[PDB]
C-alpha cells in the first residue's frame, strides 16, 4: 500500500488548469454596447423566420 500511494500521488499533468484560466481571462470587458441587433444569431433567425 506504500507502493500504491507512492505511485498514485504523481499524476501530474503538463499544462495546469490555472495555466489555462489565466490564458482564458477577459482584459477588455466589453465594447459596442448596441450589438443585440448587429448580429441576431441564426438560433434567433430561425425563430424570426
Amino acid at each position: 500500500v506504500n507502493k500504491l500511494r507512492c505511485d498514485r500521488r504523481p499524476i501530474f499533468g503538463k499544462n495546469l488548469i490555472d495555466l489555462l484560466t489565466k490564458d482564458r481571462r477577459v482584459k477588455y470587458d466589453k465594447s459596442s454596447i448596441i450589438d443585440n441587433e448587429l448580429i441576431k444569431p441564426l438560433q434567433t433567425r430561425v425563430l424570426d423566420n
Binding site: 465594447s31 459596442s32 454596447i33 448596441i34 448587429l38 448580429i39 441576431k40 444569431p41 441564426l42 438560433q43
Partner: protein, 441 residues
C-alpha cells in the same frame, strides 16, 4: 527593444503641400516615389475612389517594403492596413474566391460609438411609496420607488418607476453593494463592498471600494470592427444545450461557404445604421507584395473585382521585368503580369541610390544598432558597399562590431573589417565557389 533591418524608416519625409526633401524622415532619396505615396495617402484619406492599385518597379533594397511600411504607419489605427503575399492565398481548406472575399470584408471597417447614462453610488435604503389600491381590490399600491446612492463626493437619490422592485427582487440587491440602473431603460444590475470585507475570515464574496465621482455620469466607447467580424458572428453557431450550437462546437466548424444572402443582409443593416449617424464606415488598405507568382486565374479575378462598389484600395508590389507570367507560360509579359493588368493600372518606378545616400543609409543603420566606425575604416566600408551591395554591408557590419567587442574594442578599424571580408563571401563569390570547387562544394 528589437530591430530587424528596420526601426529607422518612419514616414516618407512628408510635409504640407506635398514636398519631399533630400535627407529627412528616415527615407533618403526617392523624392518621386515618396511624393507619389503621399498623394496616395491623401487619396486614401479622401475615401472617394474604390479599388485602385499601384505597382512598383525596381531592384533589391529600393524601398518597396519600406514604402509599404511607411504608408501603413501613416494610416494609423484609424484605417486598417493588411499586408499579404499571394503565396498565402494557396488555402487548401477553402477556395481562392472565398479567401479574397474574406480579405475584402476584412479591409472594410465600421466605427461604432455610443454613450449610456450610468447612475452609481451605494443603496442607502429601499422603502415603498404606498398608495391605496385604486383598481379591483384594495390594500397596497406603491406609487413609485426612490432609492438613495452615494459615490465619492456625490450623493443623490433616484426617483424611479415602482417596477424596479422586480429588479430589486430579481437582482437580490441586499443593501448598498452595487447599483446599475438608468433613467429610461431602468432595472438594477449587480456585480459587496470592501468595508464589509473583514467581516468574514474567508468566503467567496466580492468587494469593491466606494464608487468615485457623482451619482450620474456618462461613458464614451469607440470601436472599429470589420464587417467580416459581424459575418462570422452571424455564421458561427454559439450556444449551449441546443443541438445546433453544441453539434457545431463538437464538429470543429470549418470555413463554411457563407451564403451571399446573409452578406447582403449584413451590408443592408450596416448601411441603415451608418446613415442614421450611429455608425460610419472606414475603408482598409490591403497590400500584397512579390506578386510575380500570382497566376492567371487570380489576374482575371482581380481584373473583374477592380470595379466593385465597396472595394477598398489594394496596393501591389513586385520587381520582375521581362519574364514569363507565373501560372502558365503562354503569357510572357513584363513584371510577371499580363498586359491585361499593366495597361489598366498605375506603374511607379524605383531605382537604387547614390554613394552619398547609400553611405548615409549605412551610417544611420550603424547608429540604430549603437555600433560605430571611424572614417579611416568607414571610407573603405562605403567603397566596398558600392562594390558589393547595400544589404551586404548592412548585414556584415554587425559581425565586424561583435568581433571587435569580443576583441576588447568598441570601434571598427581596418583589421576587423579586412579579415571579416576575407572570411565571408557573397552571391558572385557563391557562383565562383559553385563553378571552381570540384569536391561537390
Amino acid at each position: 527593444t528589437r530591430t530587424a533591418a528596420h526601426t529607422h524608416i518612419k514616414g516618407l519625409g512628408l510635409d504640407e503641400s506635398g514636398v519631399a526633401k533630400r535627407v529627412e524622415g528616415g527615407f533618403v532619396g526617392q523624392i518621386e516615389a515618396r511624393e507619389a505615396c503621399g498623394v496616395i495617402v491623401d487619396l486614401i484619406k479622401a475615401k472617394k475612389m474604390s479599388g485602385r492599385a499601384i505597382l512598383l518597379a525596381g531592384g533589391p533594397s529600393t524601398g518597396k517594403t519600406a514604402l509599404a511600411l511607411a504608408i501603413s504607419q501613416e494610416l494609423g489605427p484609424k484605417v486598417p492596413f493588411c499586408p499579404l503575399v499571394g503565396s498565402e492565398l494557396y488555402s487548401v481548406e477553402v477556395k481562392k474566391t472565398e479567401t479574397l472575399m474574406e480579405n475584402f470584408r476584412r479591409a472594410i471597417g465600421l466605427r461604432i460609438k455610443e454613450t449610456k447614462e450610468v447612475y452609481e453610488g451605494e443603496v442607502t435604503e429601499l422603502t415603498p411609496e404606498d398608495a391605496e389600491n385604486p383598481l379591483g381590490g384594495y390594500g397596497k399600491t406603491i406609487s413609485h420607488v426612490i432609492v438613495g446612492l452615494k459615490s465619492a463626493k456625490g450623493t443623490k437619490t433616484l426617483r424611479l418607476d415602482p417596477t424596479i422592485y422586480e429588479s430589486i427582487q430579481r437582482e437580490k440587491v441586499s443593501i448598498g453593494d452595487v447599483i446599475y440602473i438608468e433613467a429610461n431603460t431602468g432595472a438594477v444590475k449587480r456585480v459587496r463592498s470592501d468595508a464589509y470585507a473583514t467581516e468574514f475570515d474567508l468566503e467567496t464574496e466580492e468587494y469593491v471600494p466606494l464608487p468615485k465621482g457623482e451619482v450620474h455620469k456618462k461613458k464614451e466607447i469607440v470601436q472599429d470592427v470589420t464587417l467580416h467580424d459581424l459575418d462570422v458572428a452571424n455564421a458561427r453557431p454559439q450556444g449551449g444545450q441546443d443541438v445546433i450550437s453544441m453539434m457545431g462546437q463538437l464538429l470543429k466548424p470549418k470555413k463554411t461557404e457563407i451564403t451571399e444572402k446573409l452578406r447582403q443582409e449584413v451590408n443592408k443593416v450596416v448601411a441603415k445604421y451608418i446613415d442614421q449617424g450611429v455608425a460610419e464606415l472606414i475603408p482598409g488598405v490591403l497590400f500584397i507584395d512579390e506578386v510575380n507568382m500570382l497566376d492567371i486565374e487570380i489576374f482575371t479575378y482581380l481584373n473583374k473585382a477592380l470595379e466593385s462598389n465597396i472595394a477598398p484600395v489594394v496596393v501591389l508590389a513586385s520587381n520582375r521585368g521581362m519574364t514569363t507570367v507565373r501560372g502558365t507560360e503562354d503569357v510572357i509579359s513584363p513584371h510577371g503580369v499580363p498586359p491585361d493588368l499593366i495597361d489598366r493600372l498605375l506603374i511607379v518606378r524605383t531605382l537604387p541610390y547614390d554613394k552619398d545616400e547609400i553611405r548615409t543609409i549605412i551610417e544611420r543603420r550603424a547608429t540604430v544598432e549603437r555600433l560605430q566606425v571611424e572614417s579611416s575604416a568607414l571610407d573603405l566600408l562605403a567603397t566596398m558597399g558600392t562594390e558589393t551591395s547595400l544589404r551586404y554591408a548592412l548585414q556584415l557590419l554587425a559581425p565586424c562590431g561583435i568581433l571587435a567587442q569580443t576583441s576588447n574594442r568598441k570601434e571598427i578599424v581596418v583589421n576587423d573589417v579586412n579579415e571579416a571580408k576575407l572570411l565571408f563571401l557573397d552571391a558572385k563569390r557563391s557562383t565562383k565557389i559553385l563553378e571552381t570547387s570540384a569536391n561537390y562544394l
